[PDB]
Amino acid sequence: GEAPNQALLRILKETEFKKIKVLGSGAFGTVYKGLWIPEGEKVKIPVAIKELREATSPKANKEILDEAYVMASVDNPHVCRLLGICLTSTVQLITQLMPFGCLLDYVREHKDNIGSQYLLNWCVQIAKGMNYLEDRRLVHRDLAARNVLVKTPQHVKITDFGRAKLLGAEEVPIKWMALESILHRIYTHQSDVWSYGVTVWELMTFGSKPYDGIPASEISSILEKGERLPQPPICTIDVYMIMVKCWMIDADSRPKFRELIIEFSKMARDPQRYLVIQGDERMHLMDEEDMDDVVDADEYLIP
Ligand SMILES: Nc1ncnc2c1ncn2[C@@H]1O[C@H](COP(=O)(O)OP(=O)(O)NP(=O)(O)O)[C@@H](O)[C@H]1O
């Protein structure tokens, strides 16, 4: 039976926060960098503010609220933090600012400076995030490098709950999908594991596109034929065999997230044994003056 969901949904006054910069437009909506000053509190919290495309079509109001619902109900160091909503005219989603942006852009932009320690720690942290969702019985359904955010090079969090569901519920990123999901729209914790596999492959190839070329329509055929993504240059057979296990047809044959935490964690203790990166040993990885009161969202706790 389902426990009552007692998450608090915080409604925020438009006056409590100043926008500052656009971060990402075009696609569907507009995300700004900003600072949130709660009521009378004397803290300023860096935040991202997702005020969706001006037009207020009741269709997409229903979709930003579902995210808010999910994000308000999660609480884990490796899942993105929702501060609250603003009901202005178009619904504003207010999350913790993740200054380094999405992990896909971050690996793409920084290939030459990314060591094995970072790559494997990311793997461990993503698997922790996903394991936590598994404990809350959430199937994410859209895990990808584009949907993991970077608070710092050493701390990432899963984002984009716009397709999350409870395991069992009944209510398209084809290249990240478990075969049962493309064929039967079955979606399980184990189909999230498939997508973890792809996300890891995106990281290990420093942001390549999976099945670059092959059009979406061909994908399910390819997999039934038994083809998978190729071994990235930097990966030992050890790392790659974990990817491949995530991509087994038998869903229950795939690893569990808790096993993934364990395995990458072992590897993270000796990173150079597991990823082979040219120049590994030597790699290493805001605004205004009134910054006395700045507090990261992670240090701003609410009773
Ligand atoms: N909390 C955040 N902190 C910093 N940057 C963010 C944050 N949320 C989003 N962004 C940036 O804005 C981009 C677009 O945001 P997002 O709304 O996730 O993309 P989208 O294509 O509109 N939908 P989706 O990727 O499915 O969530 C992200 O990839 C980031 O570069």
Side-chain angles (χ1 to χ4, degrees), residues 23-32 47-50 52 67 80-81 95-102 105 142 146-150 159-162:
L23 288 181
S25 69
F28 207 82
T30 316
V31 183
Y32 303 90
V47 292
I49 299 166
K50 185 156 88 162
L52 226 55
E67 277 193 62
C80 269
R81 165 88 182 273
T95 60
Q96 182 181 197
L97 182 54
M98 305 287 275
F100 294 89
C102 131
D105 296 336
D142 198 20
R146 74 188 119 91
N147 293 333
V148 168
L149 301 173
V150 184
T159 194
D160 198 4
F161 294 86

PDB file of all heavy atoms in Angstrom, residues 23-32 47-50 52 67 80-81 95-102 105 142 146-150 159-162, ligand 1:
ATOM      1  N   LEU A  23      19.511  31.415 -19.501  1.00  0.00           N
ATOM      2  CA  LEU A  23      20.429  30.294 -19.566  1.00  0.00           C
ATOM      3  C   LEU A  23      20.154  29.400 -20.775  1.00  0.00           C
ATOM      4  O   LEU A  23      21.073  28.801 -21.322  1.00  0.00           O
ATOM      5  CB  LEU A  23      20.390  29.483 -18.263  1.00  0.00           C
ATOM      6  CG  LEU A  23      21.001  30.049 -16.971  1.00  0.00           C
ATOM      7  CD1 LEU A  23      20.851  29.041 -15.850  1.00  0.00           C
ATOM      8  CD2 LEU A  23      22.479  30.458 -17.115  1.00  0.00           C
ATOM      9  N   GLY A  24      18.900  29.322 -21.199  1.00  0.00           N
ATOM     10  CA  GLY A  24      18.513  28.408 -22.258  1.00  0.00           C
ATOM     11  C   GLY A  24      17.094  28.707 -22.670  1.00  0.00           C
ATOM     12  O   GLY A  24      16.194  28.686 -21.835  1.00  0.00           O
ATOM     13  N   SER A  25      16.910  28.992 -23.962  1.00  0.00           N
ATOM     14  CA  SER A  25      15.655  29.524 -24.514  1.00  0.00           C
ATOM     15  C   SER A  25      15.035  28.528 -25.496  1.00  0.00           C
ATOM     16  O   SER A  25      14.778  27.373 -25.122  1.00  0.00           O
ATOM     17  CB  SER A  25      15.905  30.880 -25.205  1.00  0.00           C
ATOM     18  OG  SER A  25      16.685  30.739 -26.398  1.00  0.00           O
ATOM     19  N   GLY A  26      14.801  28.996 -26.732  1.00  0.00           N
ATOM     20  CA  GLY A  26      14.338  28.188 -27.880  1.00  0.00           C
ATOM     21  C   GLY A  26      13.481  26.971 -27.561  1.00  0.00           C
ATOM     22  O   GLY A  26      12.273  27.109 -27.311  1.00  0.00           O
ATOM     23  N   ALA A  27      14.127  25.793 -27.554  1.00  0.00           N
ATOM     24  CA  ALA A  27      13.482  24.477 -27.359  1.00  0.00           C
ATOM     25  C   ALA A  27      12.014  24.556 -26.879  1.00  0.00           C
ATOM     26  O   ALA A  27      11.115  24.759 -27.714  1.00  0.00           O
ATOM     27  CB  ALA A  27      14.351  23.550 -26.463  1.00  0.00           C
ATOM     28  N   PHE A  28      11.759  24.430 -25.570  1.00  0.00           N
ATOM     29  CA  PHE A  28      10.372  24.511 -25.083  1.00  0.00           C
ATOM     30  C   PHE A  28      10.035  25.772 -24.271  1.00  0.00           C
ATOM     31  O   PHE A  28       9.021  26.427 -24.544  1.00  0.00           O
ATOM     32  CB  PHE A  28       9.948  23.236 -24.349  1.00  0.00           C
ATOM     33  CG  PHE A  28       8.452  22.984 -24.391  1.00  0.00           C
ATOM     34  CD1 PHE A  28       7.856  22.382 -25.517  1.00  0.00           C
ATOM     35  CD2 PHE A  28       7.630  23.355 -23.316  1.00  0.00           C
ATOM     36  CE1 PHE A  28       6.459  22.150 -25.565  1.00  0.00           C
ATOM     37  CE2 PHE A  28       6.236  23.125 -23.354  1.00  0.00           C
ATOM     38  CZ  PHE A  28       5.653  22.521 -24.477  1.00  0.00           C
ATOM     39  N   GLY A  29      10.878  26.114 -23.294  1.00  0.00           N
ATOM     40  CA  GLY A  29      10.660  27.304 -22.448  1.00  0.00           C
ATOM     41  C   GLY A  29      11.913  28.137 -22.221  1.00  0.00           C
ATOM     42  O   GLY A  29      12.869  28.060 -22.998  1.00  0.00           O
ATOM     43  N   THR A  30      11.909  28.924 -21.147  1.00  0.00           N
ATOM     44  CA  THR A  30      13.049  29.789 -20.814  1.00  0.00           C
ATOM     45  C   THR A  30      13.517  29.639 -19.360  1.00  0.00           C
ATOM     46  O   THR A  30      12.726  29.855 -18.434  1.00  0.00           O
ATOM     47  CB  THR A  30      12.728  31.273 -21.095  1.00  0.00           C
ATOM     48  OG1 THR A  30      12.071  31.376 -22.360  1.00  0.00           O
ATOM     49  CG2 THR A  30      14.012  32.109 -21.123  1.00  0.00           C
ATOM     50  N   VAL A  31      14.797  29.284 -19.174  1.00  0.00           N
ATOM     51  CA  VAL A  31      15.385  29.133 -17.840  1.00  0.00           C
ATOM     52  C   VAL A  31      16.305  30.290 -17.595  1.00  0.00           C
ATOM     53  O   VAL A  31      17.188  30.522 -18.407  1.00  0.00           O
ATOM     54  CB  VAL A  31      16.241  27.854 -17.706  1.00  0.00           C
ATOM     55  CG1 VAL A  31      16.757  27.734 -16.296  1.00  0.00           C
ATOM     56  CG2 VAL A  31      15.464  26.610 -18.102  1.00  0.00           C
ATOM     57  N   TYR A  32      16.103  30.993 -16.479  1.00  0.00           N
ATOM     58  CA  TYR A  32      16.970  32.096 -16.037  1.00  0.00           C
ATOM     59  C   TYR A  32      17.824  31.721 -14.849  1.00  0.00           C
ATOM     60  O   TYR A  32      17.413  30.924 -14.028  1.00  0.00           O
ATOM     61  CB  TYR A  32      16.144  33.313 -15.609  1.00  0.00           C
ATOM     62  CG  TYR A  32      15.238  33.822 -16.685  1.00  0.00           C
ATOM     63  CD1 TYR A  32      13.942  33.341 -16.809  1.00  0.00           C
ATOM     64  CD2 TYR A  32      15.684  34.788 -17.596  1.00  0.00           C
ATOM     65  CE1 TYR A  32      13.099  33.807 -17.811  1.00  0.00           C
ATOM     66  CE2 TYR A  32      14.856  35.261 -18.604  1.00  0.00           C
ATOM     67  CZ  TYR A  32      13.568  34.768 -18.712  1.00  0.00           C
ATOM     68  OH  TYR A  32      12.747  35.223 -19.720  1.00  0.00           O
ATOM     69  N   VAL A  47      19.466  30.345  -7.924  1.00  0.00           N
ATOM     70  CA  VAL A  47      18.368  29.517  -8.391  1.00  0.00           C
ATOM     71  C   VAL A  47      18.287  29.595  -9.887  1.00  0.00           C
ATOM     72  O   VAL A  47      18.722  30.578 -10.501  1.00  0.00           O
ATOM     73  CB  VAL A  47      16.967  29.964  -7.790  1.00  0.00           C
ATOM     74  CG1 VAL A  47      16.899  29.707  -6.288  1.00  0.00           C
ATOM     75  CG2 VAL A  47      16.625  31.454  -8.132  1.00  0.00           C
ATOM     76  N   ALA A  48      17.772  28.525 -10.464  1.00  0.00           N
ATOM     77  CA  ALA A  48      17.295  28.509 -11.827  1.00  0.00           C
ATOM     78  C   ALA A  48      15.759  28.641 -11.755  1.00  0.00           C
ATOM     79  O   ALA A  48      15.087  28.083 -10.862  1.00  0.00           O
ATOM     80  CB  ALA A  48      17.712  27.187 -12.553  1.00  0.00           C
ATOM     81  N   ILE A  49      15.215  29.383 -12.712  1.00  0.00           N
ATOM     82  CA  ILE A  49      13.791  29.754 -12.742  1.00  0.00           C
ATOM     83  C   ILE A  49      13.279  29.345 -14.089  1.00  0.00           C
ATOM     84  O   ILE A  49      13.726  29.896 -15.095  1.00  0.00           O
ATOM     85  CB  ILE A  49      13.624  31.275 -12.624  1.00  0.00           C
ATOM     86  CG1 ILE A  49      14.200  31.775 -11.314  1.00  0.00           C
ATOM     87  CG2 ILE A  49      12.134  31.684 -12.780  1.00  0.00           C
ATOM     88  CD1 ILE A  49      14.366  33.262 -11.282  1.00  0.00           C
ATOM     89  N   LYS A  50      12.388  28.363 -14.128  1.00  0.00           N
ATOM     90  CA  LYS A  50      11.896  27.887 -15.406  1.00  0.00           C
ATOM     91  C   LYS A  50      10.475  28.381 -15.656  1.00  0.00           C
ATOM     92  O   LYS A  50       9.521  27.665 -15.370  1.00  0.00           O
ATOM     93  CB  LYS A  50      11.995  26.357 -15.533  1.00  0.00           C
ATOM     94  CG  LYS A  50      11.598  25.839 -16.915  1.00  0.00           C
ATOM     95  CD  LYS A  50      12.212  24.481 -17.244  1.00  0.00           C
ATOM     96  CE  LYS A  50      11.346  23.320 -16.752  1.00  0.00           C
ATOM     97  NZ  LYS A  50      11.665  22.010 -17.398  1.00  0.00           N
ATOM     98  N   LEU A  52       7.891  28.885 -18.273  1.00  0.00           N
ATOM     99  CA  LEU A  52       7.747  28.287 -19.601  1.00  0.00           C
ATOM    100  C   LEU A  52       7.226  29.288 -20.665  1.00  0.00           C
ATOM    101  O   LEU A  52       6.616  30.331 -20.326  1.00  0.00           O
ATOM    102  CB  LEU A  52       6.955  26.958 -19.564  1.00  0.00           C
ATOM    103  CG  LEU A  52       7.566  25.793 -20.381  1.00  0.00           C
ATOM    104  CD1 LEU A  52       9.031  25.493 -19.999  1.00  0.00           C
ATOM    105  CD2 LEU A  52       6.752  24.518 -20.257  1.00  0.00           C
ATOM    106  N   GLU A  67       6.129  17.952 -12.859  1.00  0.00           N
ATOM    107  CA  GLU A  67       7.516  18.013 -12.432  1.00  0.00           C
ATOM    108  C   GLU A  67       7.657  18.505 -11.030  1.00  0.00           C
ATOM    109  O   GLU A  67       8.437  17.936 -10.266  1.00  0.00           O
ATOM    110  CB  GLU A  67       8.342  18.912 -13.319  1.00  0.00           C
ATOM    111  CG  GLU A  67       8.808  18.206 -14.547  1.00  0.00           C
ATOM    112  CD  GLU A  67       9.875  18.989 -15.248  1.00  0.00           C
ATOM    113  OE1 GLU A  67      10.951  19.203 -14.626  1.00  0.00           O
ATOM    114  OE2 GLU A  67       9.621  19.396 -16.412  1.00  0.00           O
ATOM    115  N   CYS A  80      17.904  16.641  -8.242  1.00  0.00           N
ATOM    116  CA  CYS A  80      17.758  18.084  -8.240  1.00  0.00           C
ATOM    117  C   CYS A  80      16.757  18.616  -7.246  1.00  0.00           C
ATOM    118  O   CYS A  80      15.681  18.052  -7.049  1.00  0.00           O
ATOM    119  CB  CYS A  80      17.461  18.591  -9.630  1.00  0.00           C
ATOM    120  SG  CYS A  80      18.985  18.977 -10.467  1.00  0.00           S
ATOM    121  N   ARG A  81      17.102  19.749  -6.662  1.00  0.00           N
ATOM    122  CA  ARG A  81      16.329  20.324  -5.564  1.00  0.00           C
ATOM    123  C   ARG A  81      15.346  21.419  -5.996  1.00  0.00           C
ATOM    124  O   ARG A  81      15.750  22.421  -6.548  1.00  0.00           O
ATOM    125  CB  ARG A  81      17.293  20.861  -4.487  1.00  0.00           C
ATOM    126  CG  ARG A  81      16.687  21.811  -3.447  1.00  0.00           C
ATOM    127  CD  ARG A  81      16.095  21.110  -2.229  1.00  0.00           C
ATOM    128  NE  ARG A  81      15.484  22.057  -1.300  1.00  0.00           N
ATOM    129  CZ  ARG A  81      16.143  22.688  -0.337  1.00  0.00           C
ATOM    130  NH1 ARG A  81      17.437  22.477  -0.175  1.00  0.00           N
ATOM    131  NH2 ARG A  81      15.513  23.529   0.464  1.00  0.00           N
ATOM    132  N   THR A  95      14.305  26.088  -9.087  1.00  0.00           N
ATOM    133  CA  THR A  95      15.203  24.998  -8.655  1.00  0.00           C
ATOM    134  C   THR A  95      16.561  25.545  -8.236  1.00  0.00           C
ATOM    135  O   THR A  95      16.866  26.709  -8.453  1.00  0.00           O
ATOM    136  CB  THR A  95      15.419  23.971  -9.746  1.00  0.00           C
ATOM    137  OG1 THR A  95      16.022  24.610 -10.899  1.00  0.00           O
ATOM    138  CG2 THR A  95      14.101  23.290 -10.116  1.00  0.00           C
ATOM    139  N   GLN A  96      17.357  24.706  -7.592  1.00  0.00           N
ATOM    140  CA  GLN A  96      18.724  25.048  -7.282  1.00  0.00           C
ATOM    141  C   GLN A  96      19.493  25.323  -8.577  1.00  0.00           C
ATOM    142  O   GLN A  96      19.428  24.530  -9.501  1.00  0.00           O
ATOM    143  CB  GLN A  96      19.369  23.901  -6.537  1.00  0.00           C
ATOM    144  CG  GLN A  96      20.799  24.181  -6.125  1.00  0.00           C
ATOM    145  CD  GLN A  96      21.410  23.007  -5.403  1.00  0.00           C
ATOM    146  OE1 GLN A  96      22.441  23.140  -4.719  1.00  0.00           O
ATOM    147  NE2 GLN A  96      20.783  21.838  -5.555  1.00  0.00           N
ATOM    148  N   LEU A  97      20.171  26.470  -8.642  1.00  0.00           N
ATOM    149  CA  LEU A  97      21.083  26.770  -9.749  1.00  0.00           C
ATOM    150  C   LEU A  97      22.212  25.728  -9.824  1.00  0.00           C
ATOM    151  O   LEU A  97      22.908  25.473  -8.843  1.00  0.00           O
ATOM    152  CB  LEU A  97      21.705  28.169  -9.584  1.00  0.00           C
ATOM    153  CG  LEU A  97      22.647  28.583 -10.721  1.00  0.00           C
ATOM    154  CD1 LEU A  97      21.963  28.474 -12.081  1.00  0.00           C
ATOM    155  CD2 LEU A  97      23.195  29.963 -10.547  1.00  0.00           C
ATOM    156  N   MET A  98      22.402  25.144 -10.984  1.00  0.00           N
ATOM    157  CA  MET A  98      23.486  24.197 -11.179  1.00  0.00           C
ATOM    158  C   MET A  98      24.474  24.858 -12.158  1.00  0.00           C
ATOM    159  O   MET A  98      24.342  24.691 -13.376  1.00  0.00           O
ATOM    160  CB  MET A  98      22.918  22.868 -11.686  1.00  0.00           C
ATOM    161  CG  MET A  98      21.815  22.276 -10.761  1.00  0.00           C
ATOM    162  SD  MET A  98      22.578  21.629  -9.242  1.00  0.00           S
ATOM    163  CE  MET A  98      23.048  19.997  -9.798  1.00  0.00           C
ATOM    164  N   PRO A  99      25.450  25.621 -11.623  1.00  0.00           N
ATOM    165  CA  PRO A  99      26.167  26.652 -12.407  1.00  0.00           C
ATOM    166  C   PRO A  99      26.939  26.089 -13.585  1.00  0.00           C
ATOM    167  O   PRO A  99      27.039  26.734 -14.618  1.00  0.00           O
ATOM    168  CB  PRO A  99      27.132  27.280 -11.389  1.00  0.00           C
ATOM    169  CG  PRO A  99      26.598  26.852 -10.022  1.00  0.00           C
ATOM    170  CD  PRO A  99      25.942  25.541 -10.230  1.00  0.00           C
ATOM    171  N   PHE A 100      27.435  24.863 -13.462  1.00  0.00           N
ATOM    172  CA  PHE A 100      28.219  24.303 -14.541  1.00  0.00           C
ATOM    173  C   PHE A 100      27.381  23.703 -15.671  1.00  0.00           C
ATOM    174  O   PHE A 100      27.923  23.216 -16.669  1.00  0.00           O
ATOM    175  CB  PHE A 100      29.247  23.336 -13.966  1.00  0.00           C
ATOM    176  CG  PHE A 100      30.292  24.014 -13.113  1.00  0.00           C
ATOM    177  CD1 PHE A 100      30.090  24.196 -11.758  1.00  0.00           C
ATOM    178  CD2 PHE A 100      31.482  24.479 -13.684  1.00  0.00           C
ATOM    179  CE1 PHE A 100      31.039  24.846 -10.961  1.00  0.00           C
ATOM    180  CE2 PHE A 100      32.454  25.093 -12.904  1.00  0.00           C
ATOM    181  CZ  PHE A 100      32.230  25.301 -11.534  1.00  0.00           C
ATOM    182  N   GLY A 101      26.055  23.763 -15.530  1.00  0.00           N
ATOM    183  CA  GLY A 101      25.130  23.323 -16.594  1.00  0.00           C
ATOM    184  C   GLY A 101      24.940  21.812 -16.632  1.00  0.00           C
ATOM    185  O   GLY A 101      25.215  21.129 -15.644  1.00  0.00           O
ATOM    186  N   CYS A 102      24.442  21.302 -17.761  1.00  0.00           N
ATOM    187  CA  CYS A 102      24.200  19.878 -17.934  1.00  0.00           C
ATOM    188  C   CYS A 102      25.501  19.084 -18.183  1.00  0.00           C
ATOM    189  O   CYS A 102      26.455  19.588 -18.804  1.00  0.00           O
ATOM    190  CB  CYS A 102      23.072  19.690 -18.972  1.00  0.00           C
ATOM    191  SG  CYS A 102      23.185  18.563 -20.383  1.00  0.00           S
ATOM    192  N   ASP A 105      26.905  18.730 -21.905  1.00  0.00           N
ATOM    193  CA  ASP A 105      27.639  19.867 -22.415  1.00  0.00           C
ATOM    194  C   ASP A 105      28.950  19.967 -21.694  1.00  0.00           C
ATOM    195  O   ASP A 105      29.923  20.458 -22.256  1.00  0.00           O
ATOM    196  CB  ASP A 105      26.879  21.196 -22.235  1.00  0.00           C
ATOM    197  CG  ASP A 105      25.587  21.246 -23.021  1.00  0.00           C
ATOM    198  OD1 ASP A 105      25.470  20.516 -24.028  1.00  0.00           O
ATOM    199  OD2 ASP A 105      24.668  22.022 -22.643  1.00  0.00           O
ATOM    200  N   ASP A 142      13.588   9.045 -18.394  1.00  0.00           N
ATOM    201  CA  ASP A 142      14.332   9.915 -19.312  1.00  0.00           C
ATOM    202  C   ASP A 142      15.806  10.213 -18.902  1.00  0.00           C
ATOM    203  O   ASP A 142      16.316  11.337 -19.110  1.00  0.00           O
ATOM    204  CB  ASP A 142      13.581  11.230 -19.557  1.00  0.00           C
ATOM    205  CG  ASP A 142      14.075  11.952 -20.818  1.00  0.00           C
ATOM    206  OD1 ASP A 142      14.698  11.295 -21.711  1.00  0.00           O
ATOM    207  OD2 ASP A 142      13.871  13.180 -20.917  1.00  0.00           O
ATOM    208  N   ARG A 146      22.111  14.529 -20.806  1.00  0.00           N
ATOM    209  CA  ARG A 146      21.513  15.842 -20.925  1.00  0.00           C
ATOM    210  C   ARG A 146      20.642  16.103 -19.720  1.00  0.00           C
ATOM    211  O   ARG A 146      20.378  17.241 -19.378  1.00  0.00           O
ATOM    212  CB  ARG A 146      20.699  15.962 -22.209  1.00  0.00           C
ATOM    213  CG  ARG A 146      19.391  15.220 -22.183  1.00  0.00           C
ATOM    214  CD  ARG A 146      18.724  15.203 -23.533  1.00  0.00           C
ATOM    215  NE  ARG A 146      18.576  13.841 -24.008  1.00  0.00           N
ATOM    216  CZ  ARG A 146      17.510  13.089 -23.790  1.00  0.00           C
ATOM    217  NH1 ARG A 146      16.482  13.578 -23.120  1.00  0.00           N
ATOM    218  NH2 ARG A 146      17.474  11.853 -24.245  1.00  0.00           N
ATOM    219  N   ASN A 147      20.213  15.042 -19.057  1.00  0.00           N
ATOM    220  CA  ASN A 147      19.359  15.224 -17.878  1.00  0.00           C
ATOM    221  C   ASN A 147      20.052  15.042 -16.550  1.00  0.00           C
ATOM    222  O   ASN A 147      19.390  14.739 -15.538  1.00  0.00           O
ATOM    223  CB  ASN A 147      18.100  14.330 -17.937  1.00  0.00           C
ATOM    224  CG  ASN A 147      17.171  14.741 -19.053  1.00  0.00           C
ATOM    225  OD1 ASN A 147      17.148  15.896 -19.456  1.00  0.00           O
ATOM    226  ND2 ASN A 147      16.414  13.796 -19.569  1.00  0.00           N
ATOM    227  N   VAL A 148      21.368  15.233 -16.533  1.00  0.00           N
ATOM    228  CA  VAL A 148      22.084  15.220 -15.262  1.00  0.00           C
ATOM    229  C   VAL A 148      22.716  16.592 -15.174  1.00  0.00           C
ATOM    230  O   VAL A 148      23.267  17.070 -16.150  1.00  0.00           O
ATOM    231  CB  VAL A 148      23.161  14.082 -15.223  1.00  0.00           C
ATOM    232  CG1 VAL A 148      24.132  14.234 -14.016  1.00  0.00           C
ATOM    233  CG2 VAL A 148      22.504  12.728 -15.237  1.00  0.00           C
ATOM    234  N   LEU A 149      22.657  17.224 -14.019  1.00  0.00           N
ATOM    235  CA  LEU A 149      23.219  18.577 -13.904  1.00  0.00           C
ATOM    236  C   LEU A 149      24.421  18.603 -12.985  1.00  0.00           C
ATOM    237  O   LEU A 149      24.566  17.731 -12.119  1.00  0.00           O
ATOM    238  CB  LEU A 149      22.166  19.616 -13.452  1.00  0.00           C
ATOM    239  CG  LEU A 149      20.920  19.764 -14.359  1.00  0.00           C
ATOM    240  CD1 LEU A 149      19.825  20.722 -13.733  1.00  0.00           C
ATOM    241  CD2 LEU A 149      21.319  20.286 -15.743  1.00  0.00           C
ATOM    242  N   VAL A 150      25.238  19.643 -13.171  1.00  0.00           N
ATOM    243  CA  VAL A 150      26.542  19.773 -12.538  1.00  0.00           C
ATOM    244  C   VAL A 150      26.560  20.948 -11.566  1.00  0.00           C
ATOM    245  O   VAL A 150      26.565  22.129 -11.959  1.00  0.00           O
ATOM    246  CB  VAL A 150      27.661  19.943 -13.622  1.00  0.00           C
ATOM    247  CG1 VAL A 150      29.025  19.987 -12.989  1.00  0.00           C
ATOM    248  CG2 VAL A 150      27.592  18.847 -14.719  1.00  0.00           C
ATOM    249  N   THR A 159      18.117  15.297 -13.077  1.00  0.00           N
ATOM    250  CA  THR A 159      17.054  16.230 -13.264  1.00  0.00           C
ATOM    251  C   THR A 159      16.029  15.727 -14.288  1.00  0.00           C
ATOM    252  O   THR A 159      16.092  14.582 -14.774  1.00  0.00           O
ATOM    253  CB  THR A 159      17.611  17.586 -13.712  1.00  0.00           C
ATOM    254  OG1 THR A 159      16.586  18.562 -13.579  1.00  0.00           O
ATOM    255  CG2 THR A 159      18.038  17.554 -15.191  1.00  0.00           C
ATOM    256  N   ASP A 160      15.086  16.622 -14.599  1.00  0.00           N
ATOM    257  CA  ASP A 160      14.032  16.392 -15.580  1.00  0.00           C
ATOM    258  C   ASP A 160      13.113  15.251 -15.236  1.00  0.00           C
ATOM    259  O   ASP A 160      13.220  14.122 -15.764  1.00  0.00           O
ATOM    260  CB  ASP A 160      14.579  16.240 -16.987  1.00  0.00           C
ATOM    261  CG  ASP A 160      13.503  16.437 -18.042  1.00  0.00           C
ATOM    262  OD1 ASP A 160      12.334  16.775 -17.676  1.00  0.00           O
ATOM    263  OD2 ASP A 160      13.813  16.247 -19.239  1.00  0.00           O
ATOM    264  N   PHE A 161      12.169  15.567 -14.371  1.00  0.00           N
ATOM    265  CA  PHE A 161      11.194  14.594 -13.955  1.00  0.00           C
ATOM    266  C   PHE A 161       9.897  14.631 -14.766  1.00  0.00           C
ATOM    267  O   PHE A 161       8.918  13.974 -14.410  1.00  0.00           O
ATOM    268  CB  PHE A 161      11.014  14.667 -12.452  1.00  0.00           C
ATOM    269  CG  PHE A 161      12.241  14.241 -11.717  1.00  0.00           C
ATOM    270  CD1 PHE A 161      13.251  15.153 -11.460  1.00  0.00           C
ATOM    271  CD2 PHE A 161      12.426  12.916 -11.371  1.00  0.00           C
ATOM    272  CE1 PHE A 161      14.380  14.770 -10.825  1.00  0.00           C
ATOM    273  CE2 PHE A 161      13.567  12.530 -10.723  1.00  0.00           C
ATOM    274  CZ  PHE A 161      14.546  13.461 -10.452  1.00  0.00           C
ATOM    275  N   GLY A 162       9.938  15.340 -15.893  1.00  0.00           N
ATOM    276  CA  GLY A 162       8.820  15.429 -16.817  1.00  0.00           C
ATOM    277  C   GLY A 162       8.279  14.144 -17.430  1.00  0.00           C
ATOM    278  O   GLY A 162       7.451  14.205 -18.318  1.00  0.00           O
TER     279      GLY A 162
HETATM  280  N1  LIG B   1      18.823  24.018 -12.208  1.00  0.00           N
HETATM  281  C1  LIG B   1      19.572  24.467 -13.238  1.00  0.00           C
HETATM  282  N2  LIG B   1      20.746  25.083 -13.025  1.00  0.00           N
HETATM  283  C2  LIG B   1      21.490  25.501 -14.066  1.00  0.00           C
HETATM  284  N3  LIG B   1      21.140  25.366 -15.365  1.00  0.00           N
HETATM  285  C3  LIG B   1      19.981  24.778 -15.711  1.00  0.00           C
HETATM  286  C4  LIG B   1      19.105  24.292 -14.645  1.00  0.00           C
HETATM  287  N4  LIG B   1      18.025  23.750 -15.256  1.00  0.00           N
HETATM  288  C5  LIG B   1      18.192  23.886 -16.603  1.00  0.00           C
HETATM  289  N5  LIG B   1      19.358  24.516 -16.872  1.00  0.00           N
HETATM  290  C6  LIG B   1      19.911  24.845 -18.224  1.00  0.00           C
HETATM  291  O1  LIG B   1      18.907  25.030 -19.239  1.00  0.00           O
HETATM  292  C7  LIG B   1      18.989  23.972 -20.203  1.00  0.00           C
HETATM  293  C8  LIG B   1      17.569  23.699 -20.639  1.00  0.00           C
HETATM  294  O2  LIG B   1      16.849  23.311 -19.467  1.00  0.00           O
HETATM  295  P1  LIG B   1      15.696  22.178 -19.554  1.00  0.00           P
HETATM  296  O3  LIG B   1      14.393  22.907 -19.273  1.00  0.00           O
HETATM  297  O4  LIG B   1      16.091  20.977 -18.699  1.00  0.00           O
HETATM  298  O5  LIG B   1      15.815  21.795 -21.134  1.00  0.00           O
HETATM  299  P2  LIG B   1      14.565  21.494 -22.115  1.00  0.00           P
HETATM  300  O6  LIG B   1      15.114  20.960 -23.419  1.00  0.00           O
HETATM  301  O7  LIG B   1      13.718  22.751 -22.202  1.00  0.00           O
HETATM  302  N6  LIG B   1      13.665  20.220 -21.318  1.00  0.00           N
HETATM  303  P3  LIG B   1      14.449  18.895 -20.472  1.00  0.00           P
HETATM  304  O8  LIG B   1      15.910  18.802 -20.876  1.00  0.00           O
HETATM  305  O9  LIG B   1      13.631  17.731 -20.995  1.00  0.00           O
HETATM  306  O10 LIG B   1      14.274  19.226 -18.999  1.00  0.00           O
HETATM  307  C9  LIG B   1      19.676  22.832 -19.435  1.00  0.00           C
HETATM  308  O11 LIG B   1      20.349  21.835 -20.195  1.00  0.00           O
HETATM  309  C10 LIG B   1      20.715  23.631 -18.689  1.00  0.00           C
HETATM  310  O12 LIG B   1      21.762  24.054 -19.585  1.00  0.00           O
END
